């Protein structure tokens, strides 16, 4: 689990998965 | 270096440009040897450049003499008492003309570090800042945590 | 090892979604590219230092014009990450032999006459 070069770190951070927000919260609506 | 050198503030002689501009240089002495090799540029300047300079600056009295006998020099005297010598030995006529114009184009103050580039005698119009500008006042002039 | 990069052509294919996102058009493309350098040649391989020295992009931002022909694009596809390319716009036409000395390039990329 070695460390990464810093620029590879930034590339991994910027390209991180962002999930699609659900239209409504399930708790307060089916 | 700054710390290792004098300094002054930006100034003029007698509020020069306020009423009427006056030219500070008032006397210019040329010593030119009639024979020396170092006095060649000086001889050219006197022979074909000093008359025109005299005409262009009628407030400057230009004396020229031929008794250093080996080395030339120009001594510029100003209204405010300052003297300033410059070597013209082994220099060209272009250099001497540029130098003499430089002498005639400056006030006789000292060429030292000007602390400020702007000198104003009335720096404020609306009243210089003090800690009570932009600060309110309260009823009867009470300090905080008073009673009466 | 580290080697030159051959960019697949698939990337250089404007889509119907890209076209309305920048002020362009598939048909009737644009004559000239205005290109500026926004990154240092230092810390990059020599086959980019030389390209930049060839496109006249030595100085920093300092925009410079080039043809939009594939012989130059092949060079700009190597230095595409050290430059900004915008398309020159001429909404008043090429200047005449008069108005050459009274032109101006606005930040939007339009060349105009008499400011």
């Amino acid at each position: 689990r070695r460390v990464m070069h810093f620029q590879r770190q930034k590339l991994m951070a910027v390209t991180e998965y962002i999930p699609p927000k659900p239209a409504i919260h399930p708790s307060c609506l089916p | 270096t700054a710390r290792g050198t004098p300094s002054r503030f930006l100034a003029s002689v007698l509020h020069n440009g306020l009423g009427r501009y006056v030219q500070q240089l008032q006397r210019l002495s040329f010593s030119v040897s009639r024979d020396g090799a170092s006095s060649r540029g000086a001889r050219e300047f006197v022979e074909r450049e000093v008359i025109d300079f005299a005409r262009r600056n009628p407030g400057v009295v230009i004396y020229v003499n031929s008794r250093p006998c080996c080395v030339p020099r120009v001594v510029a005297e100003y209204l405010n008492g300052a003297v300033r010598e410059e070597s013209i030995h082994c220099k060209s006529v272009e250099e001497i003309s540029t130098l003499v114009q430089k002498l005639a184009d400056q006030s006789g103050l000292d060429v030292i570090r000007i602390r400020k580039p702007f000198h104003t005698d009335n720096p404020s119009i609306q009243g210089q800042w003090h800690p009570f500008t932009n600060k309110p006042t309260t009823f009867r002039g009470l300090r905080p945590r008073e009673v009466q | 090892k580290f080697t030159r990069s051959r960019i697949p052509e698939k990337v250089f294919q404007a889509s119907p979604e890209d076209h309305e996102k920048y002020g362009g058009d598939p048909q009737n493309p644009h004559k000239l590219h205005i290109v500026t350098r926004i990154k240092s040649t230092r810390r990059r391989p020599y086959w980019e230092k030389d390209i930049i020295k060839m496109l006249g992009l030595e100085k920093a931002h300092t925009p410079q014009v080039h043809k939009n022909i594939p012989s130059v694009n092949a060079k700009l596809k190597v230095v595409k990450h050290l430059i900004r390319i915008k398309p020159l716009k001429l909404p008043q036409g090429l200047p005449a032999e008069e108005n050459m000395s009274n032109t101006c390039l606005k930040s939007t990329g339009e060349l105009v006459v008499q400011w």
Binding site: - | - | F12, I69, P70, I83, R84
Partner: protein
């Protein structure tokens, strides 16, 4: 220690550069000509420019010399009288 903690400012800087280069991608997928159309249209200018380089390179030679310059050096003893 050795690992770092990529900030948000760095992410925003990187996204700025990514967007600029995506625009660059776009402005290179539409050339005015094709490979075959362009061929030769600059030949005349290139030939003339290289001929200018050649004529510059093949002109080196010592400068002239004038008698006036040599005799002017006698001025270093010019005197009044």
């Amino acid at each position: 220690r050795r690992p770092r903690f990529v900030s948000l400012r760095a992410k925003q800087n990187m996204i700025r550069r990514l967007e600029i280069e995506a625009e660059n991608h776009y402005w290179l997928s539409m050339p005015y000509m094709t490979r075959e159309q362009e061929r030769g249209h600059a030949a005349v200018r290139r030939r003339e420019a290289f001929e200018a380089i050649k004529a510059a390179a093949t002109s080196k030679f010592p400068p002239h010399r004038f008698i006036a310059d040599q005799l002017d050096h006698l001025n270093v003893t010019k005197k009044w009288s």
